[PDB]
Amino acid sequence: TIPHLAIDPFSLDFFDDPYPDQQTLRDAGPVVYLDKWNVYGVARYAEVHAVLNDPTTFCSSRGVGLSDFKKEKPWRPPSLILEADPPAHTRPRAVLSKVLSPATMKTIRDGFAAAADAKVDELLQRGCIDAIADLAEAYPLSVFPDAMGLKQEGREHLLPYAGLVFNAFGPPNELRQTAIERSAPHQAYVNEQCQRPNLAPGGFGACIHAFTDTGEITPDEAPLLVRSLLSAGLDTTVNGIGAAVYCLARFPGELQRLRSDPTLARNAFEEAVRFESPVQTFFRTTTREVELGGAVIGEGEKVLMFLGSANRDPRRWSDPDLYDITRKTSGHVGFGSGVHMCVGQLVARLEGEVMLSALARKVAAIDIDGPVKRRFNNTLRGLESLPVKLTPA
């Protein structure tokens, strides 16, 4: 009753061009079985959204990667928010929610916007730059580590650690084994920076520790919550901003609409999140026998959600393969959905908005003028190099 497919969603060929395989995954049925990894898969919007909003059946406490925490030991201590279910998830979620709250955005916006405007002006003086190294990575590195309150020493470990984190959600393929092997130096740095003495007062890290006074988290939980932000707060925005620039480079008509109305910056970034879905997939584990799309899934089964496929499902989106900065993007699952929806989504959107604002006001054209190279990761979709020429407005 359930179609069995041999597609490896974590193969380089899949990363290189996943859209044909994603349609095959959607059209095969509402629920598929991937024989390559012995997991169930859902690629349509309806089922993906349903699974995300059914946390008591499709839990996260057994890991959101392929590995089942009930069967294998996690490569690192489990995340207190991402890899937990209610009610354990609730209070740590509230702390991060308050640390990264709307009120908090008010304190960082001006600095974040200034850094974006300055970076775009700097890149315009160069002309031909790498939109990844010089923009997608440079800007987040210039604002987020400081917003966390991190020291200068050791920041070179931040992106390597993130790449490891997101590769480790995948199956035990070469990408994951290479990332976990000899990762101790990255882990030692991050875990050290998670301790209260190493976080500058006023930053996200210190603010997390400050919440230990309230009873919402204990002092020994605060380092693991800081670890969450250090795991998810940087690499995500790199591929998010990189996706937006990549879209603007490929759709000149949409860059021109953005130029004509810079207030579309925020929704231009949101559409890029839908269009590219920098976070491609996550797993859930069934806590009981459950019927999904006419298929009966047993207990303790892994279920792979194709967030990117769901964001391009023609059953839900008109012209899903078109970048449209005025699209009504509400309902896309690029940030998740339900109790686990991205708690850092205001930080991501703030970075994306202010960078696209800067481009909208300062740049007239973005032309790809060099070899484009894709960056392969079991969970993240993004580019390794994006040579572009920036024409000043």
Ligand X SMILES: CC(=O)Cc1ccc(C(=O)O)cc1
What residues form the annotated binding site for heme b?
A: 89, 93, 284, 340, 342
In whole angstroms, how close is the CB of 193 to ligand X at the nearest point?
14
In whole angstroms, how close is the CB of 78 to ligand X at the nearest point?
9
Restricted to residues 231-260, the positions that interact with ligand X (CB under 6 A) are: 231-232, 236
Q: Region of 179 please: left (phi>0), alpha (psi -120 to 50) or beta.
A: alpha
- For 113, the enclosing helix (H) or strand (E) is helix 102-126
Under a CB-based contact definition with an 8 Å cutoff, are residues 211 and 98 in contact? yes
Partner interacting with residue 76 (select from Cl ion, ligand X, ligand HEM, none; CB below 5-8 Å by kind)? Cl ion
Query: Alpha helix locations (H) across 17-89?
Result: 19-28, 45-52
Q: Give binding residues as ranges.
A: 89, 93, 284, 340, 342
Residue ranges that bind ligand HEM, judged by CB under 6 A? 60, 64, 81-82, 93, 96, 100, 228-229, 232-233, 236-237, 240, 273, 278-279, 282, 334-336, 340, 342-344, 347-348
The CB-nearest residue to ligand X is 232
**How many other C-beta atoms are found inside a 10 Å radius of the C-beta of residue 216?**
15
The neighbouring-strand residues paired with 297 are 290
Partner interacting with residue 187 (select from ligand HEM, Cl ion, ligand X, none; CB below 5-8 Å by kind)? Cl ion
Beta strands 290-292 and 128-130, pairing class:
unpaired
Partner interacting with residue 165 (select from Cl ion, ligand X, ligand HEM, none; CB below 5-8 Å by kind)? ligand X
- Residue 79 lies near ligand X (rule: CB under 6 A): yes
- Give the contact letters, 164-193, x = binds to ligand X (CB under 6 A), - = no: -x----------------------------
Helices (H) and strands (E) in the chain, counts: 16, 13
Beta strands 32-34 and 39-42, pairing class:
antiparallel
Give the residue among 275, 366, 371, 257 at the shortest CA–CA distance from 323: 275
Closest to ligand HEM by CB, 66 vs 81, is 81
